[PDB]
Design a protein around this ligand. Structure first.
Ligand code: DND
Ligand code: DND
Ligand code: FMN
Ligand code: FMN
Lengths: 216, 216
């Protein structure tokens, strides 16, 4: 009942620092990150998975000052995932993706690999050259991954919260992401809620279907 | 198991037009679109759900010509969902969201509404005034919804494919989206794959964890 999951999951506001993911749950949440779809299977992303106390403290440095309300969440969760996008799409990455597809057996003929390569490069160059928005295009693929991830961990029975309330410049510098060609977009602490998670008992709220949906 | 769903779902390349969603599935997918999370619960989206022959043909107009390889997906699927983002974030929309949250009982005191209203608007003007990218910020919330949606319909046993290969200017004009304040971002046909779906029997391909994940 994935609809029941969607109506029961929520953004956790406080995590129990004594409750850790199992070894199997930790493997599964990385599978979720890995197997998210993306346009042209571009996978323009990298993920920092912080589970040690020092690692999470490094992530939490980005939630200082104006974002202090998000700091404890990053310190208290079991596993803290930093979602990162590539800052520029390059031909080396397009080759890495198509060569991984080739090794995985997705091309039955050389014609199929050449068409998959040409099609992906044509669409990536539309963003790289024509629209000059490949950084935005790739970041959108990362947000799609986040949405897949939040529903996935909810269906696993894990608590989580997506966070944009952090200083991405501080987080990027903390993990040297700019020199690697990545930038942090969303931080998602994952674990089990604590008694201070006031959002666990509040009702959900969405705009009504009469507003957001047009049936045609 | 939701990890089984993630490992088994695929982008459907051909649909069986005779396999419709059930009435119950058609109601579930609307709740699935509605209850996706979004930054500050901004819900900056609208969805066209085309299920009639005329409606699906109208959406398919956006795939004529250069994007013709996506046209039959839009025509043959049971239901076709058009994900749209608001073109600009306005104060009236933010008040609509907070009014809905209050009506649903999320605020215990008046000091809980205003701190929520000003917390949403302080972060809203971060993209409206400072970073001048609220259109991009809203689009990213819509992509997050798409990711929630593809895992969701996959958990329901339904087939789907997310489509960026369409002409948004044609789709926007066909549904008058600009005048309503929205623009089309992703088309997702939903239904059941046919035997012509060559991607149903291809192995999935993802970059390895040693590339995309840094544990700390
Ligand atoms: N792995 C594979 N192994 C074997 N054949 C493969 C194949 N991938 C495609 N094909 C071949 O492709 C043909 C149909 O192409 P199909 O996969 O439906 O679609 P495709 O040609 O890749 O894309 C259709 C349109 O959407 C655009 N677009 C935009 C964004 C993302 C993507 C995307 O694909 O992620 C595409 C693209 O620029 C183009 O204008 C078939 O004849 C099939 O044989
Ligand atoms: N519905 C509610 N009913 C009762 N109390 C409610 C409440 N909502 C917040 N509160 C109160 O707020 C406090 C906890 O704050 P908390 O919810 O953790 O956090 P919040 O105030 O929503 O935001 C924390 C930081 O993240 C930033 N941010 C950025 C982007 C998106 C979002 C977002 O929220 O989507 C936030 C925001 O600008 C701020 O710097 C407690 O004092 C709690 O009582
Ligand atoms: C991209 C994104 C960023 C968010 N940022 C924050 C945040 O910084 N801190 C926070 O406590 N909640 C944050 N939220 C949680 C939203 O307020 C929440 O998703 C929304 O109110 C809907 O509630 P729900 O997640 O319980 O269904 C964010 C959500 C998203 C999707
Ligand atoms: C935003 C987005 C746009 C996509 N556009 C297309 C498209 O236009 N036509 C298509 O057939 N597939 C499209 N795809 C499918 C991707 O090729 C597919 O998600 C990726 O190769 C991973 O495979 P999977 O979805 O089977 O796991 C798109 C996927 C995403 C997420």
């Amino acid at each position: 009942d994935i609809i029941s999951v969607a109506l029961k999951r929520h953004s956790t506001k406080a995590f129990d620092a004594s409750k850790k993911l199992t070894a199997e749950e930790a493997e599964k949440i990385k599978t979720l990150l890995q197997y998210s779809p993306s346009s042209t299977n571009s996978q323009p992303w990298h993920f920092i998975v912080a589970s040690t106390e020092e690692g999470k403290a490094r992530v939490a440095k980005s939630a200082a000052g104006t974002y202090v309300f998000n700091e404890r969440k990053m310190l208290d969760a079991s596993h803290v995932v930093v979602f990162c996008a590539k800052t520029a799409m390059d031909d080396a990455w397009l080759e890495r993706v198509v060569d991984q597809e080739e090794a995985d057996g997705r091309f039955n003929t050389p014609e199929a690999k050449a068409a998959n390569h040409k099609g992906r490069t044509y669409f990536a160059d539309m963003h790289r050259v024509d629209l000059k928005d490949d950084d935005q295009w790739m970041a959108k693929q990362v947000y799609l991954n986040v949405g897949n991830f939040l529903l996935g961990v909810g269906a696993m029975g894990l608590d989580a919260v997506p966070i944009e309330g952090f200083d991405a410049a501080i987080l990027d510098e903390e993990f040297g992401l700019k020199e690697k060609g990545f930038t942090s977009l969303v931080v998602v602490p994952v674990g089990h809620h604590s008694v201070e998670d006031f959002n666990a008992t509040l009702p959900k709220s969405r705009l009504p279907l009469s507003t957001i949906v047009t049936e045609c």
